[PDB]
Amino acid sequence: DSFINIFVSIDKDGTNVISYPELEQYVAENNLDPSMVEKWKQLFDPDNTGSITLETFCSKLGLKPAEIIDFREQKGLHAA
Ligand SMILES: [Ca+2]
């Protein structure tokens, strides 16, 4: 899946802030390497703010927030 998709999957409450527990739950539930947590923090929370915003995620990856929002609206609709 795309980074757009994975962001929406991790951010299960839709706040457009990935909390560290959200990230950690995704890693464990998908049997990923726990080092993944540190990599996301380093790439997407470089200033160590304590969470990962949609804004910083998008700036690092060259995405716009509008792309995650579209996907979120489509996922919701599709799911229904
Ligand atoms: Ca969240």
Q: Which residues surround ligand 1, an ion (CB under 5 A)?
A: 11, 13, 15
| CA 6–ligand 1 middle distance (angstroms) | 12
The structure tokens listed for 24 are 């950690």
- Find the 5 Cα to ligand 1 centroid distance in Å: 14
Rounded to whole angstroms, the Cα distance separating 70 from 35 reads: 30
Domain that holds residue 2: 1-80
Query: Do residues 58 and 64 touch, judged by C-beta distance below 8 A?
Result: yes
Solving technique: X-ray
User: How far does CA 13 lie from the centroid of its chain?
Assistant: 11
The structural domain count of the chain equals 1
Cα(71) to ligand 1 centroid in Å equals 16
17: closest CA among 38, 42, 44? 44
Q: How many helices (H) and strands (E) does the chain have?
A: 5, 2
